[PDB]
Amino acid sequence: PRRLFEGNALLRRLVRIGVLDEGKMKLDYILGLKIEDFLERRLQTQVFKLGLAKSIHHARV
Partner 1 sequence: MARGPKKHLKRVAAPKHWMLDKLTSVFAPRPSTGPHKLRECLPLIIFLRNKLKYALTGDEVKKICMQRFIKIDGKVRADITYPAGFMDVISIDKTGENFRLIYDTKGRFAVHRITPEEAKYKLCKVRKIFVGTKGIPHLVTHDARTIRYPDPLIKMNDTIQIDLETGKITDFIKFDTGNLCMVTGGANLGRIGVITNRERHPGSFDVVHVKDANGNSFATRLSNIFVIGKGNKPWISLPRGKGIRLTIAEERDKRLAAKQSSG
Provide DSSP, 31-60: TT--HHHHHHTSHHHHHHHHS--SSHHHHH
Considering the rule CB under 8 A, would residue 50 count as an interface residue with partner 1? no
Q: In angstroms, give the least distance from the CB of 28 to partner 1.
A: 22
Residue with smaller CB distance to partner 1, 12 or 58: 12
Phi, psi of 20 (to 5 degrees): -150, 145
Site for partner 1 in 4-23 (CB under 8 A): 4-5, 9
Should residue 3 be labelled a site residue for partner 1 when binding is judged by CB under 8 A? no
